[PDB]
Each structure stands twice: as C-alpha cells, then as structure tokens.
C-alpha cells in the first residue's frame, strides 16, 4: 500500500469509485433512507479498495466506517450536485431543490449547507482526482482520534500522508505554483471541517426522527 | 493582507489572550467552568478583533463568525493548556481535572476523552506555539464562512485571502524549521485535519451544554462586546 506512486494512488482511487444508484413528500424520507442503505453496501466495497484500508484490523475498519459513513454519503451527494446549482442530486431520478426540503422540520438547514458546499466545490473547480482523494481522507481520518492500536494509528497516518503527497502531485502537474499548491491543499481540507459539521447536524436530524448501521452489519458487509 | 509571514506570526502571538484562573467539589464544578468560560469569552472578543483581517468585516459577520467558532476556540485553548499534562485537562492553573472527575455529569467523560486525545495528538506532533495561534485564527475565519448579497461575496473573498495568508504563514514556519517541502505539505495536512476533530468535539460539546442548560452567548451580547464605542 505505501509503495504506490502518486499516479498509482489516483488510478486506484478512480477505479474504486462506487456506482451512482437510483431511487426506488411524506414518502420522501422513505426513498432517501432506502437509497442511503443501498449506497452503504457499495461504500463498503469502495473502502476495501482504498489503498492501506484492508491492512487494518477488521475491528478498526468497522470503526472507521462507523465514524465516516455519513460524511462520505454527503461529500458524494455534494459532488453529484456540483453542476446543478440550487439543487441536490440524490439520484439521477431524484433531483430536489431547496423548496422541497422545507416539508421536514430541521431539514432545509442541512439542505442549505449541502448546497453551499456544492457551490464551494463549483467555484474551486474541484477535479475528480481531488474528490476521490478527499473522500479517502474522510474514511481514514474521521475515526482516528477515537480509537497494536499505536501501529494502526501510525499506519493510518502513513496512508493519510501519501494522499497528501498525491494531492500535491496532482496540483503540481496541473501547473499550480508551490504557493498555490499549499493554498489549495489547505482550502480543500478546511472544507472537510464543514463536512464533519454537516454530518454532525445531519446525524442530529436523523436522530430527531435504525439511524446508524450496526457494527455487525458493517462487519458482515466487509466479508 | 499586506503582512509578511513573520508579521502575521508576531501579530497573532501579541493578540494571545491571558490565561485565566478559576474563582473542591464536583457539585460546584459546572459553576466554576461556566464562570471561567464567560470570562474567557470577553478576552476572546479582544483577541478576535486583533486577528488580521477580522475587523475589516461587518460587525454582523464578525458576530456570526464568533457564534460559530467560540466553543471551538475555547476547546483548542484548553487542549493547548493541557498539552504538557498527559491525561489531564488544565481549565485553569488552579483547576486541573482528570478523567475520573469528569464522570459526575452524564455525557461529560466522552467529550473529555475527546479533549484528552487531541491533547495527546498535539504532543505527538510537538505542536509549536506559532503553529497553535495560526490554527486558532483559521478556526475563527473558517467555521462560519460556509453559513453566511454582494457584501457577503466580498466578505468571503476577503476571508479566503486572509486564510491564504495564514496557510503561507504555516508553511513559512515549517520551512524556517528545516522541514522539506514534502514534510511541509504533510504537516500542513496533519494540522488542518485536527480542525475536523475539533469541530466534531465542539459539536457534541454544544449538544452536552444544551443537555444541561444561557447555554450560548447571545447575538446581542456578542454584538455589544464587538461593537465598541
Ligand atoms: C442505517 C442508515 N440508514 C439510516 C439511513 O440514514 C439516512 C437517511 C437519509 C439520508 C439522505 C441521503 C441519502 C443518500 C445520499 O447519497 C445522501 C443523503 C444525504 C442526507 C443528509 C444525510 N439525506 C437526507 O435525506 C437529508 C436530510 C436533511 C437535509 C438534507 C438531506 C442519509 C442517511 C441510512
Ligand atoms: C453563555 C456561555 N456560557 C459559557 C457557556 O457554558 C460553558 C460551560 C463550561 C464550559 C467548559 C470549558 C470552560 C472553559 C474553557 O477554556 C474550556 C471549556 C471546555 C468545555 C467543553 C466546553 N467545558 C466543560 O465544562 C466540559 C463539558 C464536557 C466535557 C468536557 C468539558 C464552556 C462553556 C455558556
């Protein structure tokens, strides 16, 4: 895992991308819940293809997915919605705007944060290569502060360090100056703080109404 | 936005608020911590108004940024004060608590466990003071910028330019310390990913404060201290 080149890390992450799933006012939360449940399975198979992930124990793989899964669903939604300003593309047959999110209490606040994240992506001209790097960072970093355990944390940080090398490489070969490379790297990672914030408020909203996937479910999906 | 990296560091170190003291029983613990945080918030306002570029914003946006960031800023200051005291949080020099004293309140030890892990991460990275004040200023400018008109557009462009000047400042600090370009990028990323956990901590932290209940500084109170005459 730690021997891959920057170009090979990108190629591995791109090839590992999950498919875009389809949907099957009151029934809206039923559709969105069922869509997320089916996405999670493909998320598990994506995670196993993130270089270095399967080197961790099963127990540590599950905990990483427990802490990261909602963030990953969200950043994928934000990416899907990037070229659809003012709307969220949950699925190709489920394109919702801000108005349809007002039906549920506490819903449009998260809707607006997702819309603003997608606009932020738009005006940074986020590239697919960068997006898959960002998604893998969320997987490895979201649970690292909440765990042999020293070796696992060291391994996680080594892989996080190579993704950083990979993001700098993509920026460098795009023509960015060294100053622009540091600045863009920081800009992308500060967005990860807003995604974590979005995921926290999203979880609170979910709990205000089977909220999280169980440890046994995640473990079984890992196979 | 005209400062050099050294002038940025120098200004941020000069803006650093003082370390305050608590004014022992677990029953009075929340009263002491609440009073301490309330007094820290006054000095936080003064500190924020000295962070370069912050006063260029409208008072309205200044209030909004502090509304979104004040808990994060209190928490990172706590973690910084606790860095050299493993397994303990130094709320004040006369108020140093361990994990067993955080068990008295439901849901306290979980957030407490999170703060201890961040303190240990600061130790593991040998976080420097110059890096710490840069992180704190990034928290101020970044946490509320994604949740704000033409004025609003000009504000976010200015905030991102100041955030860019701080990123340059972090890199210059590591470059002066002999780290390679690779090590500079990697440490930059490691420091900024901690901000995700600090936002996470402040989020459960806000949940725990509402679970107890004057939970948050009000908009009018923040505006009053910011809007000086
Ligand atoms: C055991 C796990 N199951 C229990 C289920 O929890 C769910 C239930 C529903 C969602 C959807 C969903 C679906 C697919 C997607 O790609 C993304 C999302 C995004 C989002 C934010 C989270 N969501 C919403 O409706 C929403 C709410 C308020 C404001 C805006 C959007 C995700 C997870 C999953
Ligand atoms: C109106 C504004 N008021 C101020 C608000 O109330 C309070 C009351 C108390 C705290 C302390 C406090 C004080 C000083 C510090 O530097 C840091 C902190 C940190 C922390 C997490 C936040 N806190 C706790 O006790 C705690 C809780 C659960 C787990 C661990 C620690 C902050 C704010 C309401």
Please give the domain boundaries of chain B with CATH numbers for all domains: 5-226 (1.10.565.10)
- CA distance from start to end of chain B: 25
- Give the closest of B118, B182, B188 to A185, CB-based: B188
User: DSSP string spanning B94-158?
Assistant: TEEEEGGGGGSSTTHHHHHHHHHHHHHHHHHHT--HHHHHHHHHHHHHHTTGGG--HHHHHHHHH
Pairwise CB contact (< 8 Å): B189 & A185: yes
Which experimental technique did the depositors report for determining this structure? X-ray
Helices first, then strands: H and E counts in chain B:
8, 2
* Chain A interface disruption, residue of B125, B193, B209, most A CBs within 10 A: B193
Minimal Cα distance from A147: which residue of B?
B117
User: Is B161 an 8 Å CB contact of chain A?
Assistant: no
Q: Which of A50, A9, A56, A51 is nearest to A154 (CA)?
A: A56
User: Running DSSP on this structure, what letter comes out for residue B57?
Assistant: S
User: Is A119 an 8 Å CB contact of chain B?
Assistant: no
Using CB atoms within 10 A of its CB, is residue B225 exposed (0-12), middle (13-18) or buried (19+)? Answer: middle
User: Cα(A201)–Cα(A109) distance, rounded to whole angstroms?
Assistant: 9
Q: Which of B30, B34, B118 to mutate to test the pocket of ligand 2 (most atoms within 8 A of CB)?
A: B34
Residue B193 tokens, joined: 């990913």
What phi and psi values does residue A94 have, to the nearest 5 degrees? -150, 75
Q: Which of B96, B115, B104 is nearest to B205 (CA)?
A: B115
Say if residue A25 carries a ligand binding annotation.
no
User: Is A194 an 8 Å CB contact of chain B?
Assistant: yes
Residue with tokens 């934000």: A78
Resolution (A): 2.1
Gyration radius from chain A CA atoms: 17
β-bridge partners, A91: A94
The answer to whether the Cα torsion of B152, B16, B206, B223 is positive or negative is negative
* Chain A interface disruption, residue of B185, B191, B205, B207, most A CBs within 10 A: B185
Using CB atoms within 10 A of its CB, is residue B16 exposed (0-12), middle (13-18) or buried (19+)? Answer: middle
Please list every residue in chain A whose beta carbon sits closer than 8 Å to the beta carbon of residue B121. Answer: 145
User: Cα(B200)–Cα(B118) distance, rounded to whole angstroms?
Assistant: 11
- Residues B30, B212: contact at Cβ < 8 Å? yes
User: Cα(A110)–Cα(A197) distance, rounded to whole angstroms?
Assistant: 10
CA distance B93 to chain A (A): 26
Ligand nearest to the CA of B90: 2
CB count, 10 Å around CB of B156? 17
Q: Which of B37, B66, B67, B81 to mutate to test the pocket of ligand 2 (most atoms within 8 A of CB)?
A: B37
């Amino acid at each position: 895992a730690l021997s891959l080149t920057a170009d090979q890390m990108v190629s591995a992450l791109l090839d590992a991308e999950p498919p875009i799933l389809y949907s099957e006012e009151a029934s809206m939360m039923g559709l969105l819940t069922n869509l997320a449940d089916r996405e999670l399975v493909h998320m598990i198979n994506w995670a196993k293809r993130v270089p270095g992930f399967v080197d961790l124990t099963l127990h540590d793989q599950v905990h990483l997915l427990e802490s990261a899964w909602l963030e990953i669903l969200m950043i994928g939604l934000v990416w899907r919605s990037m070229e659809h300003p003012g709307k969220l593309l949950f699925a190709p047959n489920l394109l919702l705007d801000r108005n349809q999110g007002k039906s549920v209490e506490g819903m449009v606040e998260i809707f607006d944060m997702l819309l603003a994240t997608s606009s932020r992506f738009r005006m940074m001209n986020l590239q697919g290569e960068e997006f898959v790097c960002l998604k893998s960072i969320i997987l490895l970093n979201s649970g690292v502060y909440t765990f042999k355990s020293l070796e696992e944390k060291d391994h996680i940080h080594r892989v996080l360090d190579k993704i950083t090398d990979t993001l700098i490489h993509l920026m460098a070969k795009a023509g960015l100056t060294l100053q622009q490379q540091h600045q863009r790297l920081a800009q992308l990672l500060l967005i990860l703080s807003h995604i974590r914030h979005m995921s926290n408020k999203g979880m609170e909203h979910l709990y205000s109404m089977n909220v999280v996937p169980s440890y046994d479910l995640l473990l079984e999906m890992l196979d």
